[PDB]
Amino acid sequence: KRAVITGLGIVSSIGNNQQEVLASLREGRSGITFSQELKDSGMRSHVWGNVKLDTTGLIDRKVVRFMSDASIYAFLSMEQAIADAGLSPEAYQNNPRVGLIAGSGGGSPRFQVFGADAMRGPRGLKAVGPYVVTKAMASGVSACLATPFKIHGVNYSISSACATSAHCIGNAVEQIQLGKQDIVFAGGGEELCWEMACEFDAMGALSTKYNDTPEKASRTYDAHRDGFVIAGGGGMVVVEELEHALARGAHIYAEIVGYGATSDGADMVAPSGEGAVRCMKMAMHGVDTPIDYLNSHGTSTPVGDVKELAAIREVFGDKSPAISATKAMTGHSLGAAGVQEAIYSLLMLEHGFIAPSINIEELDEQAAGLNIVTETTDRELTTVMSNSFGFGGTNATLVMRKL
Amino acid sequence: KRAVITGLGIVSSIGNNQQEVLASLREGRSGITFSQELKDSGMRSHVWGNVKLDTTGLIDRKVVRFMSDASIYAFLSMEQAIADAGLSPEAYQNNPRVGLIAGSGGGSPRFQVFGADAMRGPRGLKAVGPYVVTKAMASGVSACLATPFKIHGVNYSISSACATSAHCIGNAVEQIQLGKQDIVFAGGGEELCWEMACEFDAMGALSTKYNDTPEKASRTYDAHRDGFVIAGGGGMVVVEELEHALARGAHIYAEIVGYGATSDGADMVAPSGEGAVRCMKMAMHGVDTPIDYLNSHGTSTPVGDVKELAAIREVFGDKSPAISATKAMTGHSLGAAGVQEAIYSLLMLEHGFIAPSINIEELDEQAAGLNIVTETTDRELTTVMSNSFGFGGTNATLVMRKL
Ligand SMILES: *[C@H](C(N)=O)[C@H](O)C(=O)CC/C=C/C/C=C/C
Ligand SMILES: *[C@H](C(N)=O)[C@H](O)C(=O)CC/C=C/C/C=C/C
Numbered sequence A, B: 001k002r003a004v005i006t007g008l009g010i011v012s013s014i015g016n017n018q019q020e021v022l023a024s025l026r027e028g029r030s031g032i033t034f035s036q037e038l039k040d041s042g043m044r045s046h047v048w049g050n051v052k053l054d055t056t057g058l059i060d061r062k063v064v065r066f067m068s069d070a071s072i073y074a075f076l077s078m079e080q081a082i083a084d085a086g087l088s089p090e091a092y093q094n095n096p097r098v099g100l101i102a103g104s105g106g107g108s109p110r111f112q113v114f115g116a117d118a119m120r121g122p123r124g125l126k127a128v129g130p131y132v133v134t135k136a137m138a139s140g141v142s143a144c145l146a147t148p149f150k151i152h153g154v155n156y157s158i159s160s161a162c163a164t165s166a167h168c169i170g171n172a173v174e175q176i177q178l179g180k181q182d183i184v185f186a187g188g189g190e191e192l193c194w195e196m197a198c199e200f201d202a203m204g205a206l207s208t209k210y211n212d213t214p215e216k217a218s219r220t221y222d223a224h225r226d227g228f229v230i231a232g233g234g235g236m237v238v239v240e241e242l243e244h245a246l247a248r249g250a251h252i253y254a255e256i257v258g259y260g261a262t263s264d265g266a267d268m269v270a271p272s273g274e275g276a277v278r279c280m281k282m283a284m285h286g287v288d289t290p291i292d293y294l295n296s297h298g299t300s301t302p303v304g305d306v307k308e309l310a311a312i313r314e315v316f317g318d319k320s321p322a323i324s325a326t327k328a329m330t331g332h333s334l335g336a337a338g339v340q341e342a343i344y345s346l347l348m349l350e351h352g353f354i355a356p357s358i359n360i361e362e363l364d365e366q367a368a369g370l371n372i373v374t375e376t377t378d379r380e381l382t383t384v385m386s387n388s389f390g391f392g393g394t395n396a397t398l399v400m401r402k403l
Helices: A018-027 A036-040 A069-084 A109-119 A132-136 A140-146 A161-177 A194-201 A242-248 A274-284 A302-319 A334-351 B018-027 B036-041 B069-085 B109-119 B132-136 B140-146 B161-177 B194-201 B242-248 B273-284 B302-316 B334-351
Strands: A003-011 A032-034 A047-049 A098-103 A155-159 A183-190 A233-241 A254-263 A293-295 A322-324 A383-390 A394-401 B003-011 B032-034 B047-049 B098-103 B155-159 B183-190 B233-241 B254-263 B293-295 B322-324 B383-390 B394-401
Touching: A003 A018, A003 A069, A003 A161, A003 A242, A003 A334, A018 A334, A036 A194, A069 A098, A069 A140, A069 A183, A069 A233, A069 A334, A098 A140, A098 A161, A109 A132, A109 A194, A109 B109, A109 B194, A132 A140, A132 B194, A140 A155, A140 A183, A140 B394, A155 A161, A155 B161, A155 B254, A155 B394, A161 A183, A161 A233, A161 A254, A161 A334, A161 A383, A161 A394, A161 B155, A183 A334, A194 B109, A194 B132, A233 A242, A233 A334, A254 A274, A254 A334, A254 A383, A254 B155, A274 A302, A274 A383, A274 A394, A293 A334, A302 A383, A334 A383, A334 A394, A394 B140, A394 B155, B003 B018, B003 B069, B003 B161, B003 B242, B003 B334, B018 B334, B036 B194, B069 B140, B069 B183, B069 B233, B069 B334, B098 B140, B098 B161, B109 B132, B109 B194, B132 B140, B140 B155, B140 B183, B155 B161, B161 B183, B161 B233, B161 B254, B161 B334, B161 B383, B161 B394, B183 B334, B233 B242, B233 B334, B254 B273, B254 B334, B254 B383, B273 B302, B273 B383, B273 B394, B293 B334, B302 B383, B334 B383, B334 B394
Parallel strands: A098 A155, A098 A183, A293 A322, A293 A383, B098 B155, B098 B183, B293 B322, B293 B383
Antiparallel strands: A003 A233, A003 A254, A032 A047, A155 B155, A183 A233, A254 A394, A383 A394, B003 B233, B003 B254, B032 B047, B183 B233, B254 B394, B383 B394
């Protein structure tokens, strides 16, 4: 019935493992860079939240042949989570009570495009090859992890745009609550490519006025923010039943004391706020400790940023928690945002500190009053909240508490 | 705690509604046709499981402009399921206890390729437009339905390749069991295009030797089967808590008494009979009545067909149920296969008959002591089972029983 986190893995724009991420977080270090690929593609946004690691040879050649970047990022993340959790092969493999729930927001547009492009060339089917389905299918992230890691329990992906990996973790918790699984690896991944990013630029969702200063492009809550900075990477956490964790001597980061999942039923592409209030409130049912720190979805967009702050004002009233949008540092990894930010929250809980909300040269007028921390501040935290929202009015929030 | 089906909707290769689907199922009619598009793309497979329906003015302009075919098919299926359920706006909209869990196996390869092609054109960003993300994102099917139907409960997609809509329904059931939702619209959709179809052909998964006789291409269990026939369409069912349903005088097709979801942890693109055995066994746990009819996954592939059979023989041993692969008639709608086949099963339960397993000129010698029904058989059914498997070793089976 009770679910706790006993391990985490992460490959992000601000770090290739939790120690690197930790340092980046405390230093308010940016993971955004200039992208020549995005410029050459004809986009107006040339800033990236890229993973600085050459993944070549990092996975078994026979295994990696079926994977795309989103899967590769999640795979390396799950490798870290397994080790971190102190799980031995005999403990999680070929075990019906061990599952995997991980996904991405867009699967693999790069290979969807590669397949189409190849089909129309002089080689046709032979240029396409036999590995595009597993690379391009939406469930690639879960399929490519569950098979090599020898998982026998649940195996599927939850996809909900920019809230996918958050819903993935929440679903993992429910598996533990329903007593169906003892352990479920949850998280996700997202590739970084002009193929997909150009589609966000086309709808004006990406930042375009700070290409000369990449590290200043992502500026959540700043009066002059102008869209989010697309990013890629992966994240993975080990969701485990409490007794099972305690029995093996597992190191527990926190317990998942709240999980909200609601729907706006209003606008595609734009948030309503109303659904987020219900989502946060839902995650709070039963939680009687205060929310000490709130890791906002805050993507750095004009409408989104204040819409979520309005939701928070409504849920907490005159006693809102310390807030910070780590996306100002990391960028928006879309489908991987939820699990990565849950990890940043876990690291803050574990090391007792609040990561800064960077790049706010002029706090938005609507952000007046609120406690958005703009400096790395040491503090003993106990309960933390993390929000994730996506197109189609899909909301998710997770509340984690220290034991 | 108990989940029942109180409505269904369907847009498939063998019918644009449940009445038409019933007629083809009883008649043993094939929905496969020759495809000029497929042939013209360079493919070897030129047979289709297409939806014969002009969807043109069926969905509101400002709504449909965010959708792709998978979403359009699921949307029309939802419309039918709402009416067929006897539900009205005042009862299902802006209601926190009403949710939506629907997905596709591939999202929208067509619009993803369109975006990449548009971008590379002289007009770039302006050629792409602002609607490709919602059309191409993996969660499109759920996002595009939850918003217009004003859903306020759960809202996300489950994606598991050729088992997605089956896992979607199972997840909906768990929402009712966890007491989180009273109603959850579950199902999915899949578009039909060479963009995606060419990728399956490239891995030799599609039938190529019966292009001259499309209706004979899909031949599950036949000694000369040579791959599945790709198809498109949608399906949607209303999963409702028992008491809620009885209280409103709802029409109940049956109760979902079993739901299995397992993982092979062995092969990508190839089924390991053992995972399916555990999946089926998991779905039968607690069901005190025998399985009267089994709607197999049977896609008409050399390895797949008999592997599931070996799995079935191992599960039921001596006393096996009547079996029939409706894909021999309908083709493989991939992500939409699970929900559509659950609907065929519900229709057989609701009308007391077993749909034929067509096109078996020579029964595979692997399907021995089994009961593969090859003629529409009038029978009083009580408990039915439906299997769905996908790449990455993802398995799902649903057991539905009359109340
Ligand atoms: C991101 C957000 N609102 O924070 C939004 O939910 C979103 O667009 C996620 C979808 C990304 C998948 C890419 C599909 C493009 C082909
Ligand atoms: C189908 C099967 N094994 O019956 C298989 O699970 C599958 O390939 C489903 C994925 C289809 C999504 C298309 C993605 C291609 C870009």
